């Protein structure tokens, strides 16, 4: 299995064309340079742009995309010739030199839904979300056996339906010499390669009306074996193949189809002068960012500031005694119906990196933390990460948080307190990392907030759980006519908006694979509100600043913490949303650190401490 | 690639001629001196160090690392061929296999792997940096690798057959079967020429007495949690351990294993089904685990009791009363546990005591009562469904067996766990059904509980069971019930904030202008003070009676006869004996009884 004969004349023609393409010396030297970097970085996969291959040789590019396997082995042989020409010593370190593909593939851009049987043997670029990974397991490609009786070494090389080779190959592991002597494997002299299977699922927002998302199995080998994990939105370039199986003298013509990947690309997070100019030119850049944060929602300025602090994050501290302080900031929104809690959560889902959606009734504790599932490749039971585990170093947005069961919230207790979840299931007792910020939205009991009841009975959650949240905002649908006028003006303006590429009578289209290049084709104030595209990059750069606390801001925070403690003392049992504790001090440090990150200051100043104290005052002392 | 015949002679030259200096510049042949012991059966395991091999042939080190198993076999063959050169004494036969080999040799005067009673292992070179489990990729198959990880499961030591010895019933001849594979075919009929030519029909009986076995032990290593990537599950690897490498490591041990990364061999239908794919294991070769005069002169200071109590929690002020009580928790009473419960509002430095005591305690755990999704307070069963074997995990109460277990949010404990706490506090064990069959686990541990009120802040207007919503059947088992109060207090809040801000901006405790005892000194002191086992003198029985009855009658006269019982006197005696242990005096005295009474009274004063 796996051995196929190819026509040598067209193989040599294709290899000539690809070697001409790679020998880029007389031109700009792009692929000369790239193969030099391949040698220099100790790599053995070259990523080629089919746009460049189309500019140089259009017919060879078309035949590459439509006749993937034979053309790819021709290209890889050409690459081995070229890398041998540059460095003959390096060329012998690796059995094979691989080529992955990027650029625009025309109609071969697909999703798992439109990836039909017509695309078999084609290069396809599939965009989707990773829903499963198998465990990385070695796969023998070439085994050396030493015959102790005869004192000679045989070497055998293998293939299967997955691994089409274009050279003669076996699929049986030998155990005896031709003289029937036993054979001893030379494991060190044998060659193995990493192998993993993943499942790519259709993007849910692009699915048709009544449909559930479809899936395609993908096979990753070599360097690609751990380039995508579950929850990643990815673009996989590969060859689409069927696997003709047989079962005891009989075959059902139904063959499973897999994408043998040749290239994997993430679709997230991917120069400094604009950001430096912004931080130096602007006064209180934190305010501009916060009010620019969610334009379609009017008001909620302090909640927007708090969410910006959640996005920027605090700094994670590990002490000499092993004690630990989290950097993540946790926010709870309790409020009346139709006060945009869900839309704020949806904004954070749309704009933050690794923001995981969750709702109270749609989720369970197992789905929140981790589940036992059986690897379909193997059959062994193993863990599969839940929402809060996937949200590590990210956000989990829990809407309808009051509707959740207490048994489900038991997991959230451990995740918020310690940044981990402990499990004992399958073969494994383990401590999974769940270092995620929580943005929770809830309704008060009785639906609408009651003015004639205390906040601690309007809030249906117990104080043990409420201690976990850094900030707790009460959002009330005040029926003030002034705020009603400006809010309704904003809402009707939003409902009057239409996009530029769209006609006046158009109904909203249902999604499709409109991304038709592996990289973005079109690529700081709005078209003085800050732009969303700029703000994503700015928050990305600001998250990693890691500013240090300064002594005068520390003194201010200590003074204001003790003053807030005195205010908690003088406050009645109806005039506070939460008591003031050492965790309130920790919240002040985290919020000041986030404000310092917003300024990209590298030092927490009194400017940061003032806004942190103001935000904590606003959140805590309300009724 | 290379000629292994020449490589064996190179290995012989290394083993014969390498030397190292150990003392006063004297020259010793570290491997010849061990070959002598191997020949005399004084030593069984020979750990050859490739850092030593590197001193005169790095190419041999590269060959060994890149094709380790072949070179392991070559080194074993070379050592076996060398031992007769180093023979100079007769062996004292102590294994029954020694006796059998002795009679085998005599009958031969009247199976190399069988005569081979030693085992050789590569101690890895320092140039090979230690990998994580996730980095042990397919390129390293068949190659010597060092891997760090957490031991999470270890099997019992089992006998692994190496050379099966049979005897024929008809011709009285011994037959030998070396066994390389994880499985083998037993021999049925005698292959000897005498039986075969005569068609005798004589069959073979396995002789375990004559066969060679080796200790065998499977384990599972797991990734370090902080080393796992952000969104990923921790990976795990099977390590197969043999001979003297067995029993080195236990579950929970941080280990570094130098070994050979190999694929698992399959038989029957697995090789048919799996195709080119294979599972892997690490063949273990070396497993590595990761006061009296001078400080007695310090202990002579009369401060030492308060010095220890101050060192039990230097970050907290005013609570020296509670720190002394928690000192007696760590010391324990005379045989004996001391159980303490702390009540207070959420978000108070009451979990600080749990953290500190857990950190200081030699054997300890620190869980929460809120229904863990992992192994809870009690044990649990794991299926390990690559193979399906059920295995039993301990949990908090079992893992803190001969020490102290800290339980946060003790009030939210479910009834299924409260009954287990009853089992621990009554008879110091727990019981669990593994597969319908019930097994019993030790838990001889002191419980440090921290509860919160069921709703809102603490309220002295209500009774304690009304505040905590936990029955008296739980609350009466404890020896000290403390209310860890927290009120706003301007200067104390300022100092706490200054302390925490210093901790944030410097990643270190601020200078407190006090020198607490270091943690290791405290541990050595508590061991030295708990080694004592004091006794109460009978002349003090009347005074103990007087103190108990007057405390009882004060509860009658001034607090509506709030609950007390004979376990109050027993708790006072246990506290006074713990104080006697702490003072390192083998007789309990008036001061011990007075301080125990005072401790109980001030705990109740904190409640009131």
């Amino acid at each position: 299995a796996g051995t196929v004969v190819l026509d040598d004349v067209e193989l040599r023609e294709a290899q000539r064309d690809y070697l001409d393409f790679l020998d880029d010396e007389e031109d700009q030297g792009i692929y000369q340079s790239k193969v030099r970097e391949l040698i220099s970085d100790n790599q053995y996969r070259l990523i080629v742009n089919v746009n460049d291959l189309r500019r140089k040789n259009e017919k060879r590019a078309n035949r590459l995309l439509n006749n993937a396997f034979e053309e790819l082995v021709a290209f890889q042989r050409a690459l081995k010739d070229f890398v041998a020409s540059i460095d003959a010593t390096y060329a012998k370190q690796y059995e094979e030199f691989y080529v992955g593909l990027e650029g625009s593939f025309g109609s071969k851009h697909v999703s798992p839904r439109t990836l039909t049987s017509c695309f078999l043997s084609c290069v396809v670029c599939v965009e989707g979300i990773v829903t499963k990974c198998s465990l990385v397991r070695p796969k023998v490609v070439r085994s050396v056996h030493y015959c102790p009786a005869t004192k000679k070494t045989i070497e055998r090389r293998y293939s299967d339906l997955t691994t089409l080779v274009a050279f003669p190959s076996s699929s049986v592991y030998p155990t005896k010499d031709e003289e029937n002597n036993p054979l001893e494997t030379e494991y060190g002299l044998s060659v193995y390669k990493d192998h993993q299977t993943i499942t790519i699922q259709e993007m849910p927002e692009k699915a048709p009306a009544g449909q559930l998302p479809r899936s395609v199995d993908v096979i990753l080998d070599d360097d690609l074996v751990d380039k995508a994990k579950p929850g990643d939105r990815v673009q996989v370039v590969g060859t689409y193949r069927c696997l003709p199986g047989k079962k005891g003298g009989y075959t059902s013509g139904t063959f499973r189809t897999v994408l043998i990947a040749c290239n994997v690309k993430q679709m997230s997070k991917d120069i400094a002068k604009i950001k430096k100019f912004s931080k130096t030119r602007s006064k209180d850049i934190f305010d501009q960012l916060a009010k620019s944060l969610a334009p379609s929602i009017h008001g909620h300025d302090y909640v927007k500031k708090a969410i910006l602090c959640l996005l920027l994050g605090g700094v994670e501290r590990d002490l000499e005694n092993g004690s630990h302080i989290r950097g993540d900031i946790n926010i709870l929104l309790i409020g009346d119906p139709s006060v945009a809690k869900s839309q704020l959560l949806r904004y954070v889902l749309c704009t933050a990196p690794r923001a995981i959606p969750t709702t109270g009734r749609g989720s369970s504790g197992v789905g929140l933390t981790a589940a036992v599932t059986t690897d379909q490749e193997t059959g062994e039971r193993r863990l599969e990460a839940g929402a809060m585990v996937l949200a590590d170093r990210g956000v989990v947005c829990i809407d309808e948080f009051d509707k959740m069961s207490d048994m489900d919230r038991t997991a959230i207790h451990e995740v918020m307190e310690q940044g981990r979840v402990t499990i004992a299931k399958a073969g494994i007792h383990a401590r999974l990392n769940a270092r995620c910020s929580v943005l929770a939205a809830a309704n008060p009991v009785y639906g609408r907030y009651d003015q004639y009841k205390t906040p601690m009975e309007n809030i249906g959650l117990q104080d043990s759980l409420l201690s976990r949240f850094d900030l707790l905002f009460i959002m009330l649908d005040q029926m003030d006519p002034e705020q009603d006028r400006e809010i309704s003006d904003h809402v009707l303006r939003m409902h009057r908006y239409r996009a530029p590429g769209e006609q006046d009578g158009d109904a909203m289209p249902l999604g499709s694979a409109v991304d038709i290049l592996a990289t973005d084709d079109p690529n700081l104030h709005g078209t003085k509100m800050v732009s969303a595209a700029f703000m994503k990059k700015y928050i990305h750069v600001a998250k990693i600043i890691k500013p240090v606390l300064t002594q005068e801001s520390a003194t201010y925070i200590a003074e204001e913490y003790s003053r807030l403690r005195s205010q908690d003392s003088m406050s009645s049992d109806t005039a506070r949303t939460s008591p003031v504790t050492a965790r309130t001090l920790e919240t002040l440090i985290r919020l000041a650190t986030a404000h310092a990150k917003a300024r990209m200051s590298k030092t927490v100043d009194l400017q940061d401490a003032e806004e942190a104290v103001e935000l904590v005052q606003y959140a805590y002392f309300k009724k | 690639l290379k000629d292994y015949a020449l490589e064996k002679e190179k290995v012989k030259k290394f083993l014969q001629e390498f030397y190292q200096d150990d003392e006063l510049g004297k020259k010793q042949f570290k491997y010849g001196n061990q070959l002598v012991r191997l020949a005399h059966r004084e030593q069984v395991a020979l750990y050859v160090d490739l850092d030593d091999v590197a001193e005169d042939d790095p190419e041999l080190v590269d060959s060994i690392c890149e094709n380790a198993r072949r070179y392991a076999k070559l080194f074993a063959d070379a050592v076996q061929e060398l031992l007769p050169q180093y023979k100079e004494r007769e062996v004292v036969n102590k294994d029954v296999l020694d006796v059998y080999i002795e009679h085998r040799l005599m009958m031969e005067q009247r199976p190399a792997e069988l005569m081979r009673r030693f085992e050789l292992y590569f101690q890895g070179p320092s140039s090979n940096k230690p990998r994580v489990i996730r980095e042990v990729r397919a390129d390293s198959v068949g190659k010597l690798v060092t891997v760090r990880g957490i031991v999470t499961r270890v099997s019992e030591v089992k006998p692994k057959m190496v050379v099966a010895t049979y005897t024929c019933d008809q011709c009285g001849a011994e037959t030998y079967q070396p066994i390389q594979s994880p499985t083998f075919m037993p021999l049925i009929m005698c292959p000897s020429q005498e039986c075969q030519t005569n068609r005798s029909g004589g069959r073979l009986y396995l002789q375990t007495r004559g066969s060679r076995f080796i200790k065998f032990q499977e384990m599972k290593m797991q990734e370090h949690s902080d080393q796992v990537p952000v969104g990923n599950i921790p990976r795990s690897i099977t390590v197969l351990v043999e001979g003297e490498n067995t029993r080195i490591a236990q579950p929970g041990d941080h280990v570094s294993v130098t070994g050979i990364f190999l694929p698992i061999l399959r038989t029957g239908f697995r090789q048919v089904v799996q195709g080119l794919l294979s599972e892997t294991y690490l063949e273990a070769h070396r497993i590595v685990k990761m006061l009296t005069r001078e400080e007695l002169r310090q202990i002579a200071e009369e401060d030492f009791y308060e010095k220890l109590a101050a060192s039990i929690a230097p970050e907290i002020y005013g609570h020296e009363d509670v720190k002394k009580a928690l000192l007696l928790l760590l010391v324990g009473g005379v045989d004996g546990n001391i159980n303490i419960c702390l009540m207070g509002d959420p978000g108070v430095a009451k979990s600080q005591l749990l953290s500190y005591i857990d950190r200081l305690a030699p054997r300890s755990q620190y869980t929460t009562g809120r229904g863990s999704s992992g192994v809870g307070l009690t044990a649990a069963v794991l299926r390990d469904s690559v193979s399906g074997e059920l295995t039993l995990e301990g949990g908090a109460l079992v893992l803190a067996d001969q020490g102290v277990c800290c339980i946060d949010e003790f009030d939210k404990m479910a009834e299924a766990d409260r009954t287990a706490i009853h089992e621990v506090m009554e008879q110091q064990t727990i019981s669990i059904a593994k597969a319908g069959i019930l097994t019993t686990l030790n838990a001889r541990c002191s419980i440090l509980a921290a509860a919160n009120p069921a709703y809102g802040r603490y309220n002295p207007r209500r009774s304690l069971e009304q505040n905590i919503q936990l029955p008296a059947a739980l609350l009466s088992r404890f020896d000290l019930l403390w209310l860890i109060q927290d009120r706003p207090d301007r200067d104390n809040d300022l100092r706490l904030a200054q302390h925490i801000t210093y901790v944030h901006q410097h990643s270190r405790q601020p200078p407190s202008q006090f020198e607490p005892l270091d943690m290791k000194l405290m541990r050595r002191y508590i061991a030295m003070c708990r080694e004592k086992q004091p006794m109460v003198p009978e002349s003090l029985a009347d005074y103990i009676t007087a103190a108990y009855v007057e405390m009882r009658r004060e509860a009658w006269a001034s607090k509506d006869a709030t609950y007390t019982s004979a376990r109050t006197l027993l708790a006072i005696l246990r506290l006074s004996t713990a104080l006697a242990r702490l003072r390192m005096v083998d007789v309990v005295e008036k001061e011990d009884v007075n301080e125990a009474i005072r401790l109980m009274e001030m705990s109740k004063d904190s409640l009131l």
């Binding site: 829903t131 869900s342 904004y347 959606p357 109270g360 197992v366 809407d399 309808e400 | -």
Partner: protein, 227 residues
Amino acid sequence: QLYCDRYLCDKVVPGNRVTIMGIYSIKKFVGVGIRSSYIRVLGIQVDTGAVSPQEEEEFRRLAALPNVYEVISKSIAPSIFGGTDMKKAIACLLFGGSRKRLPDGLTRRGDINLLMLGDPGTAKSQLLKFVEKCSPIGVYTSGKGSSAAGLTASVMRDPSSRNFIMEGGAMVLADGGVVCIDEFDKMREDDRVAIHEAMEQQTISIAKAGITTTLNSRCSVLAAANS
């Protein structure tokens, strides 16, 4: 069981009424000589994604005439006497608003949710039964006979392969149309809180048994209830 082939794949979806033309046949790779049967589909007639141009221009005419609103309202449940405002609101629910995505990525609902609440014998159930038949996409369910999983989406293991899969509920089956929830006051409160996200956000976020996703439920809720 139906076997579809080449262009008959994805020609229909669950909920479609069809007339199948096909070969009744056994699979050919409880009892001994038992063979499993199926229909090899050779043609599909969806009983009722395309309008002929004659229907198209007639629809332009029908939209063009000035009293189209009144004509539609009189067409809603013609066997029901009265209730003209209710029929008009039902027409508005059938046609729906316009769904929008704003520049910051936030979505605004387009579908219209309508609750009929009150006295018995007032033709509420007849209006639901009309709307379920008149809407291009429409499902009818009783509030008593429904659950949270069966309304939004359910998670279950497949006997053919031991893995957890999703199965659509009423909201998923009616995505793009109307769910007619009769007896809406009778459903349990824990089941009733399931549809809040699917009503406003028009999404169903599931995180159960390791599978974590957000399905679409862009459907109107037309509910009937008693006092």
